[PDB]
């Protein structure tokens, strides 16, 4: 595992040498290939190195980050085009990636938290540094302060577990089952925030709408998963307490998913709409996760991988349109099929994946969470039908409205799509399908 870490560390100096922007991604893509060869993992931890291991769960999430963090560099070519502190920008991602790799590769719960939040600050610099609109302040704080407010109490819950278990290592924790009501709320309300839950999602539409394209990728790509990944490790020893209060979370997320889907239909901003679509699906992920069944756990792991690639993908396309039309509102963006017809194909495939269209990896995960939820209670069929219905209602509205109609009138002349953009879109979607072939690996982490 140290092979990855020391590779990244020695790539830090590449931020300082000039005319090395493009030589960075290749080193970032090549390491993904090298990491892609060392899959021999199992449910239990493997490749121990001083505190760094990796199981099938951590592997897929790590590999997802390397892929996504590599696409960030492709997407944010404008930073290179205007030399807008590109060297500092590169160092932000290389640091950020290292924090993620450690976070998932950490074997002890305290470490996971140590790099859990620490990744936030590199993200926070990203929003303020390279965001256009003035609201990146008022969205910079929300991201920082919702997270800190609920992560600091989690730190107490972590330490209280040493004095009982005597250690942080995940395997040793699973041997215990705790009965204290507050402790349950000090290790899940901290992750329920970052999922996010419907009622505490108020930061998500602000952070995503204002953050740059690259920040949108990682915020939607890996930050929403750290909440999901964290839960998968800490419901193991909260099984008893999970049964007394699960019905509160399931109802909120399920009803939260439906209500947000209606909110999606009344949006008029591409960035906002995609961001609210994240809350909709993340409600199903959390819902199935708390069902605790074998299906709900394997499925939740799957959907987190698939959704991140998609929602990250859809943020590419919004940036492409915004870069030229200059406005992210739906009213400006119309009939793009008649300006950039080649682009509209990628709009569809990424859009179709978001609505659980086949043969994507997204449908495999969504079939499963749906199974666990139904088994949990037949009453869940009511909204789970509504949520899947409306989860396509806004996706069509997102795609159709922005691509189909007659062209805008005031738009000034702008460049057409470039090869970089097409290559970026392929790398987002094409794995999202081929992964179905080897779901063997990225599914059975239990």
């Amino acid at each position: 595992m140290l092979k990855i870490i020391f590779f990244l560390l020695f790539l830090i100096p590449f931020c300082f040498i000039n005319n090395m922007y493009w030589m960075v991604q290749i080193m970032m893509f090549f390491i993904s290939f090298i990491f892609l060869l060392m899959n021999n993992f199992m449910n239990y931890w493997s490749e121990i190195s001083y505190f760094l291991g990796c199981d099938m769960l951590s592997y897929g999430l790590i590999l997802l980050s390397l892929w996504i963090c590599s696409l960030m560099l492709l997407a944010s070519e404008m930073i290179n085009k205007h030399n807008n502190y590109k060297n500092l920008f590169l160092l932000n991602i290389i640091i950020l990636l290292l924090l993620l790799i450690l976070t998932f590769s950490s074997m002890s719960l305290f470490m996971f938290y140590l790099f859990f939040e620490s990744s936030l600050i590199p993200t926070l610099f990203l929003i303020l540094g390279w965001g256009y609109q003035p609201e990146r302040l008022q969205a910079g704080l929300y991201l920082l302060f919702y997270t800190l407010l609920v992560s600091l109490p989690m730190l107490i819950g972590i330490f209280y577990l040493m004095n009982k278990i005597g250690s942080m290592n995940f395997y040793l924790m699973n041997n215990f089952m705790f009965n204290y009501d507050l402790l349950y709320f000090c290790l899940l309300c901290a992750f329920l925030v970052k999922m996010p839950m419907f009622l505490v999602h108020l930061w998500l539409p602000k952070a995503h709408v204002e953050a740059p394209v690259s920040g949108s990728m990682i915020l939607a790509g890996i930050m929403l998963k750290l909440g999901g990944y964290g839960m998968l490790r800490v419901i193991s020893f909260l099984q008893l307490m999970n049964l007394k209060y699960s019905f509160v979370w399931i109802s909120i997320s399920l009803v939260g998913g439906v209500l947000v889907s209606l909110v999606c239909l009344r949006q008029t901003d591409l960035k906002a709409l995609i961001a609210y679509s994240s809350v909709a699906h993340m409600g199903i992920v959390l819902s199935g996760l708390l069902t605790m069944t074998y299906w709900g756990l394997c499925g939740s792991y799957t959907l987190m991988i698939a959704h991140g690639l998609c929602s990250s993908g859809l943020f590419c396309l919004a940036n492409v349109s915004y870069e030229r039309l200059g406005s992210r509102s739906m009213l400006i963006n119309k009939g793009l099929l008649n300006f950039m017809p080649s682009m509209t194909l990628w709009w569809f495939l990424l859009s179709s994946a978001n609505m659980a269209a086949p043969p994507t990896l997204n449908l495999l995960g969504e079939i499963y969470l749906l199974n666990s939820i139904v088994s949990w209670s037949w009453i869940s069929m009511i909204l789970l039908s509504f949520l899947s219905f409306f989860s396509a209602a806004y996706t069509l509205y997102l795609y159709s409205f922005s691509q189909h109609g007659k062209l805008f009138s005031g738009v000034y002349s702008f460049s057409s799509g470039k090869i970089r953009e097409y290559l970026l879109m392929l790398l987002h979607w094409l794995p999202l399908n081929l992964l179905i072939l080897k779901s063997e690996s990225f599914m059975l982490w239990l």
């Binding site: 001083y50 505190f51 002890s108 305290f110 470490m111 942080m168």
Partner: protein, 58 residues
């Protein structure tokens, strides 16, 4: 009575006598067998088991 007036400073001097009481005060030392013990210097100090034992042994 053939007595003599002692010199002016005769009685201001230290006067050492032969104690007829013959019971000069004794001497003893208090004993606390229950005193808070400390680590003795002769105690051997091998390396700690797994070092610091902090979080990730750091």
């Amino acid at each position: 009575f053939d007595w003599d007036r002692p010199s002016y400073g005769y009685f201001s001097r230290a006067k050492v006598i032969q104690s007829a009481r013959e019971a000069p005060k004794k001497e003893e030392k208090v004993s606390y067998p229950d005193a808070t013990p400390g680590l003795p210097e002769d105690y051997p100090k091998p390396p700690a088991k797994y070092g610091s034992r902090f979080h990730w042994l750091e």
